[PDB]
Amino acid sequence: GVGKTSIARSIARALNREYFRFSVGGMTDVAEIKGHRRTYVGAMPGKIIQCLKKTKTENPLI
Amino acid sequence: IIKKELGLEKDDKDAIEEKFRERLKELVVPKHVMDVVDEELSKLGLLDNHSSEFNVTRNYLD
Ligand SMILES: Nc1ncnc2c1ncn2[C@@H]1O[C@H](COP(=O)(O)OP(=O)(O)O)[C@@H](O)[C@H]1O
């Protein structure tokens, strides 16, 4: 609670590149970063692809 | 075509979606479990109805 998220947001704003946070602690499913081959029904890509799509920029502050 | 055009489309996965929503309806759902249930329902919908991960999601939802 030292404002790590807030300070990261502030540096993202100051540097002018789009901001985005990512929580990895406690995760076990590596597929969340890799998605699935798309052969599976309803398969979705890795969360980083979603981050890039939402941010709309190729140089966000992950 | 009779089944789909009549207006019953999107009724799929209702046994695992609508029935549980009704089951929760009578219950005064706290916000925490409400959002957890929404996330689990979304994961169930994304996953294919015939996979082990879908079965685990259904079991946790039940
Ligand atoms: N100097 C500050 N200015 C603004 N917000 C702060 C400051 N210090 C702490 N905070 C707040 O503390 C919260 C903490 O998040 P963070 O420290 O990243 O991890 P944690 O989840 O452990 O709190 C933020 O929401 C932030 O708004």
Short mmCIF file of C-alpha atoms and ligand atoms in Angstrom, two decimals:
data_model
loop_
_atom_site.label_atom_id
_atom_site.label_comp_id
_atom_site.label_asym_id
_atom_site.label_seq_id
_atom_site.Cartn_x
_atom_site.Cartn_y
_atom_site.Cartn_z
CA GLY A 1 0.00 0.00 0.00
CA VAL A 2 2.75 2.47 -0.88
CA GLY A 3 0.81 3.70 -3.89
CA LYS A 4 2.70 1.32 -6.17
CA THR A 5 -0.32 1.10 -8.47
CA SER A 6 -0.96 4.84 -8.18
CA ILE A 7 2.70 5.76 -8.72
CA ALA A 8 2.84 3.43 -11.72
CA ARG A 9 -0.25 5.17 -13.10
CA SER A 10 1.36 8.57 -12.49
CA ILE A 11 4.57 7.60 -14.30
CA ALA A 12 2.51 6.16 -17.16
CA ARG A 13 0.65 9.47 -17.43
CA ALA A 14 3.83 11.56 -17.25
CA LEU A 15 5.66 9.44 -19.83
CA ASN A 16 2.55 9.83 -22.07
CA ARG A 17 2.33 6.11 -22.93
CA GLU A 18 -0.95 4.35 -22.24
CA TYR A 19 -1.34 2.68 -18.85
CA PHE A 20 -2.44 -0.85 -17.98
CA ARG A 21 -2.11 -2.93 -14.81
CA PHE A 22 -1.71 -6.70 -14.64
CA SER A 23 -2.07 -9.05 -11.65
CA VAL A 24 -0.05 -12.27 -11.75
CA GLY A 25 0.22 -13.27 -8.08
CA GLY A 26 -1.32 -16.63 -7.27
CA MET A 27 -1.94 -17.44 -10.94
CA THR A 28 -1.33 -21.00 -12.16
CA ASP A 29 -2.95 -21.16 -15.62
CA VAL A 30 -0.20 -20.16 -18.04
CA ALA A 31 -2.88 -20.19 -20.75
CA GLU A 32 -3.99 -16.78 -19.45
CA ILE A 33 -0.88 -15.43 -21.20
CA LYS A 34 -1.12 -17.85 -24.16
CA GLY A 35 -4.85 -18.39 -24.69
CA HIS A 36 -5.56 -21.46 -26.80
CA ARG A 37 -4.95 -22.50 -30.40
CA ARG A 38 -8.49 -21.20 -31.28
CA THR A 39 -9.52 -24.75 -32.27
CA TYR A 40 -11.36 -24.97 -28.95
CA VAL A 41 -14.87 -23.55 -28.98
CA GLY A 42 -14.89 -20.08 -27.44
CA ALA A 43 -11.11 -20.01 -27.08
CA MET A 44 -9.59 -16.58 -26.42
CA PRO A 45 -6.02 -15.31 -26.83
CA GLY A 46 -3.54 -14.47 -24.10
CA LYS A 47 -4.40 -11.58 -21.81
CA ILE A 48 -1.57 -9.55 -23.37
CA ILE A 49 -3.38 -9.59 -26.72
CA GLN A 50 -6.46 -8.22 -24.97
CA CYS A 51 -4.30 -5.59 -23.27
CA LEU A 52 -2.86 -4.47 -26.61
CA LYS A 53 -6.31 -4.41 -28.21
CA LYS A 54 -7.90 -2.37 -25.41
CA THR A 55 -4.96 0.02 -25.11
CA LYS A 56 -5.04 0.54 -28.91
CA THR A 57 -1.30 1.33 -28.76
CA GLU A 58 1.78 -0.82 -29.36
CA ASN A 59 3.83 0.78 -26.56
CA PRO A 60 1.73 0.72 -23.37
CA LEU A 61 3.13 0.62 -19.83
CA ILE A 62 2.44 -2.95 -18.74
CA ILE B 1 -34.95 -23.83 -38.48
CA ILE B 2 -38.24 -24.07 -36.58
CA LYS B 3 -36.34 -24.24 -33.29
CA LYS B 4 -34.08 -21.27 -34.07
CA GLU B 5 -36.36 -18.91 -36.03
CA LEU B 6 -39.24 -19.19 -33.54
CA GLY B 7 -37.31 -17.04 -31.05
CA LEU B 8 -35.74 -19.73 -28.84
CA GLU B 9 -32.26 -18.85 -30.12
CA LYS B 10 -29.68 -18.03 -27.42
CA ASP B 11 -31.64 -20.36 -25.10
CA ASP B 12 -28.65 -22.71 -25.18
CA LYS B 13 -26.66 -23.16 -21.95
CA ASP B 14 -29.74 -21.92 -20.06
CA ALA B 15 -29.92 -25.03 -17.88
CA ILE B 16 -26.49 -24.04 -16.52
CA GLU B 17 -27.16 -20.27 -16.80
CA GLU B 18 -30.85 -19.41 -16.36
CA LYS B 19 -31.68 -22.05 -13.74
CA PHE B 20 -28.77 -20.99 -11.52
CA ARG B 21 -29.65 -17.32 -11.97
CA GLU B 22 -33.18 -18.07 -10.78
CA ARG B 23 -31.78 -20.16 -7.92
CA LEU B 24 -29.80 -17.10 -6.82
CA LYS B 25 -32.76 -14.76 -7.42
CA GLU B 26 -34.68 -15.85 -4.32
CA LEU B 27 -31.43 -15.58 -2.35
CA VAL B 28 -30.37 -12.12 -1.19
CA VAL B 29 -27.01 -12.26 -2.96
CA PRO B 30 -24.11 -10.33 -1.39
CA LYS B 31 -21.99 -8.29 -3.78
CA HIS B 32 -18.89 -10.47 -3.40
CA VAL B 33 -20.61 -13.75 -4.26
CA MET B 34 -22.66 -11.93 -6.89
CA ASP B 35 -19.56 -10.83 -8.80
CA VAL B 36 -17.88 -14.21 -8.28
CA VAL B 37 -20.96 -15.92 -9.74
CA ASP B 38 -21.01 -13.50 -12.67
CA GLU B 39 -17.35 -14.22 -13.43
CA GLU B 40 -17.92 -17.97 -13.15
CA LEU B 41 -20.94 -17.76 -15.46
CA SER B 42 -18.89 -15.81 -18.00
CA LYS B 43 -16.12 -18.42 -17.87
CA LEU B 44 -18.70 -21.20 -18.27
CA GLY B 45 -20.21 -19.46 -21.29
CA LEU B 46 -16.84 -18.94 -22.96
CA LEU B 47 -15.77 -22.56 -22.40
CA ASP B 48 -17.15 -25.36 -24.56
CA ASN B 49 -19.98 -27.35 -23.01
CA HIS B 50 -18.08 -30.63 -23.51
CA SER B 51 -14.67 -30.16 -21.84
CA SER B 52 -13.23 -31.01 -18.44
CA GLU B 53 -12.64 -27.35 -17.55
CA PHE B 54 -16.29 -26.69 -18.38
CA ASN B 55 -17.29 -29.55 -16.08
CA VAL B 56 -15.20 -28.09 -13.24
CA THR B 57 -16.73 -24.66 -13.84
CA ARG B 58 -20.21 -26.19 -13.74
CA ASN B 59 -19.41 -28.06 -10.52
CA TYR B 60 -18.14 -24.91 -8.81
CA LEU B 61 -21.17 -22.97 -10.06
CA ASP B 62 -23.53 -25.61 -8.65
N1 LIG C 1 0.87 9.52 -2.18
C1 LIG C 1 -0.25 8.91 -2.65
N2 LIG C 1 -1.05 9.53 -3.55
C2 LIG C 1 -2.17 8.95 -4.03
N3 LIG C 1 -2.58 7.73 -3.66
C3 LIG C 1 -1.88 6.99 -2.76
C4 LIG C 1 -0.64 7.56 -2.20
N4 LIG C 1 -0.15 6.63 -1.35
C5 LIG C 1 -0.99 5.56 -1.37
N5 LIG C 1 -2.02 5.78 -2.22
C6 LIG C 1 -3.13 4.84 -2.49
O1 LIG C 1 -2.85 3.53 -1.97
C7 LIG C 1 -3.38 2.52 -2.84
C8 LIG C 1 -2.42 1.34 -2.93
O2 LIG C 1 -2.04 0.45 -3.98
P1 LIG C 1 -0.60 -0.27 -3.99
O3 LIG C 1 0.27 0.44 -2.96
O4 LIG C 1 -0.13 -0.31 -5.42
O5 LIG C 1 -0.81 -1.80 -3.53
P2 LIG C 1 -1.78 -2.31 -2.35
O6 LIG C 1 -2.81 -3.16 -3.06
O7 LIG C 1 -0.85 -3.09 -1.44
O8 LIG C 1 -2.36 -1.07 -1.72
C9 LIG C 1 -3.65 3.19 -4.19
O9 LIG C 1 -5.02 3.00 -4.57
C10 LIG C 1 -3.34 4.66 -3.98
O10 LIG C 1 -4.42 5.49 -4.45
#
